[PDB]
RNA sequence: AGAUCUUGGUGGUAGUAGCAAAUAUUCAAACGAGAACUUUGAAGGCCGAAGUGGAGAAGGGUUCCAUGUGAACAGCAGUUGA
């Protein structure tokens with residue numbers, strides 16, 4: 001299918017390790033976008049403002065180590081665009097990250 | 108207007124021109140040398156790849172201080188770059204030339220860039236300020252560009 | 261489109277700073293049509309322009 | 324009057340910010 | 355400044371009035387030889403005499 | 405052919421030096437051919453009342469305000485602008 005939506009968890013700690021203080025949250029957004037592109041094969045990746053707030057919750061340098069996100073591939077068939085598919089990345093609040101798998105989520 | 112290198116048969120050929128274009132003459136000359144002789148579709152996709160930094164133009168004559176890249180090995184060279192503005196200007200000129208070919212009624216799937224030439228335009232003066240109350244030039248280096256496409260397959 | 265004038269007029273009418281002026285991000289065209297302080301007042305009455313509350317500076321810790 | 328469809332979308336328009344921001348009071352059109 | 359004399363204000367008024375472009379129909383006159391107002395003044399580039 | 409000659413023009417240098425003082429930006433949307441820079445909203449920060457706030461004197465002189473344009477200028481860009 002191509003209108004699939006899945007729930008992933010991302011090791012922001014792993015993807016941000018080594019980045020300077022004033023760059024950690026922007027680089028976390030860039031790595032989330034790159035992760036979405038790699039997983040869903042869509043150059044068009046939109047990041048929800050709630051997800052952006054979740055990443056920036058603890059300031060610019062103390063980004064959360066792990067984050068639970070939901071990647072939804074959706075039809076871009078609303079206008080004449082080079083890409084007919086886009087990935088919306090939303091924020092999934094969780095209480096713990098233990099034993100969380102990548103799961104297909106229904107409609 | 109007078110082009111240099113008039114076509115051998117001005118019925119299988121179309122022309123494009125631009126004057127006082129605000130792009131760097133050296134980068135544009137290197138890009139034109141890169142796309143010279145290409146089929147029009149190949150040149151279009153190559154210029155798009157240059158904009159996307161997937162193919163480089165080799166800097167052969169104006170290579171002072173130009174860094175090395177892995178994509179320069181496609182050409183017999185070592186130094187290459189990705190002049191985005193030169194690529195976009197040449198893409199606009201190629202679209203204009205393809206429209207001229209459409210107007211002349213010759214199919215645009217067999218056009219090859221046989222002539223392309225970049226000339227220096229009159230420089231435009233701006234001003235910069237130096238250490239001890241001194242003024243120095245901040246010239247631009249615009250270029251005229253011309254190209255002649257010809258049908259062959 | 262560009263609502264610098266509307267933000268300035270809303271600040272002047274609401275007697276607050278431009279920090280506290282909230283323009284509706286969805287009714288951009290309706291706010292952009294407002295070029296006078298009467299129209300700014302009408303938008304304030306209709307709820308498209310809102311004075312945001314003062315950022316909380318509590319004194320409970322001090323007490 | 325309020326039904327389930329009206330309530331579920333009303334929650335969206337009254338929220339104009341994250342936690343700790345004032346809620347929207349009204350959005351009235353009048354010509 | 356905000357405080358100014360009448361003569362200074364009149365001088366500035368004349369400068370404001372004569373700092374404007376040429377009319378478009380001037381270039382259509384017979385034997386014009388005028389392309390633009392070469393006496394244009396900008397408040398930040400060059401300063402007035404006073 | 406010279407005079408560190410006069411005036412004007414043009415090279416190599418060289419697409420080089422450089423565009424590194426004062427902590428910092430991010431997400432979405434709108435307008436738009438075009439958005440790192442415009443506007444709006446959300447978030448994270450800074451000035452921290454001896455201010456990066458609010459008002460004057462001298463000086464400037466229309467820079468003030470609205471609309472429009474995107475030639476040149478704003479040492480990148482700009483849909484913005486003193």
Ligand SMILES: [Mg+2]
Nearest residue numbers: 171172173420
């Ligand atoms: Mg060198």
Ligand SMILES: [Mg+2]
Nearest residue numbers: 235236237238
């Ligand atoms: Mg300097």
Ligand SMILES: [Mg+2]
Nearest residue numbers: 238239240241
């Ligand atoms: Mg000086």
Ligand SMILES: [Mg+2]
Nearest residue numbers: 397398399401
């Ligand atoms: Mg001055």
Ligand SMILES: [Mg+2]
Nearest residue numbers: 405406409410
């Ligand atoms: Mg001589």
Ligand SMILES: [Mg+2]
Nearest residue numbers: 172420421422
């Ligand atoms: Mg350099």
Ligand SMILES: [Mg+2]
Nearest residue numbers: 421422423424
């Ligand atoms: Mg530098």
Ligand SMILES: [Mg+2]
Nearest residue numbers: 449450451452
């Ligand atoms: Mg502070």
Ligand SMILES: [Mg+2]
Nearest residue numbers: 455457458459
């Ligand atoms: Mg002050």
Ligand SMILES: [Mg+2]
Nearest residue numbers: 467468469486
């Ligand atoms: Mg102004």
Ligand SMILES: [Mg+2]
Nearest residue numbers: 478479480481
């Ligand atoms: Mg510029």
